[PDB]
Design a protein around this ligand. Sequence first.
Ligand SMILES: CC(C)(C)[C@@H]1NC(=O)O[C@@H]2CCC[C@H]2OC/C=C/C(F)(F)c2nc3ccccc3nc2O[C@@H]2C[C@@H](C(=O)N[C@]3(C(=O)NS(=O)(=O)C4(C)CC4)C[C@H]3C(F)F)N(C2)C1=O
Ligand SMILES: [Cl-]
Ligand SMILES: [Zn+2]
Length: 201
Amino acid sequence: GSHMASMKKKGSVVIVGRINLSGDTAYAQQTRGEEGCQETSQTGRDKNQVEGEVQIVSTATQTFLATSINGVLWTVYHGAGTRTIASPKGPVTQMYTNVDKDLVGWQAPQGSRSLTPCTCGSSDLYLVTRHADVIPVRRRGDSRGSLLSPRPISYLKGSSGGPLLCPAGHAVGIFRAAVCTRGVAKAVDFIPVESLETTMR
Ligand SMILES: CC(C)(C)[C@@H]1NC(=O)O[C@@H]2CCC[C@H]2OC/C=C/C(F)(F)c2nc3ccccc3nc2O[C@@H]2C[C@@H](C(=O)N[C@]3(C(=O)NS(=O)(=O)C4(C)CC4)C[C@H]3C(F)F)N(C2)C1=O
Ligand SMILES: [Cl-]
Ligand SMILES: [Zn+2]
């Protein structure tokens, strides 16, 4: 048995900032503080203006990234679970949910700009972190990319759901996991944009 009247309800994912890539410089902006975030998570009502392609998102327990591609705001399942995302009209239910791919997706919020899938097949990739780092990545497989310079896994923590981009800024994939050997990250694993387009069809 269970006491249903006391049964808690998980809050919504909340947009708390963005990675600005419109100008010549990449920098992160915070659009909502902790206090406002928690109330927005429980209300599901977020009246703030949304801009850009790469959002910073947070639950009450985790913070990560979400990327807009082909009208869908994508993130990772292990960060968002099955949660709604806050919006001006209230909590918005997931349009896509695939745990096998560690992928979820919502309707892209009004005011967001979607990235266009990459069609160049370039090996030179670039990972956008939550700190607005643009890290070069050499593509090694369908869902793998090698870090030109190995880093502590710390620097990539909280960047799942962020994008791997082509040289033209086209979306190549969604950062999902890291190839870690005892604390260091040598490569990254990502959801290919073609796997996104497969899920959408
Ligand atoms: C050792 C390690 C590096 C921690 C781990 N490596 C690893 O497993 O590599 C193997 C070998 C090559 C690919 C991968 O195959 C297994 C697939 C794992 C997965 F990703 F598909 C995943 N599916 C889930 C589905 C349902 C429920 C939970 C799931 N949990 C998963 O993975 C978990 C989480 C994921 C993670 O940390 N992602 C990142 C991140 O920043 N998250 S986050 O924003 O801070 C946060 C937790 C708030 C949301 C980008 C990496 C950053 F830190 F660099 N993990 C563990 C790892 O990366
Ligand atoms: Cl996949
Ligand atoms: Zn490209």
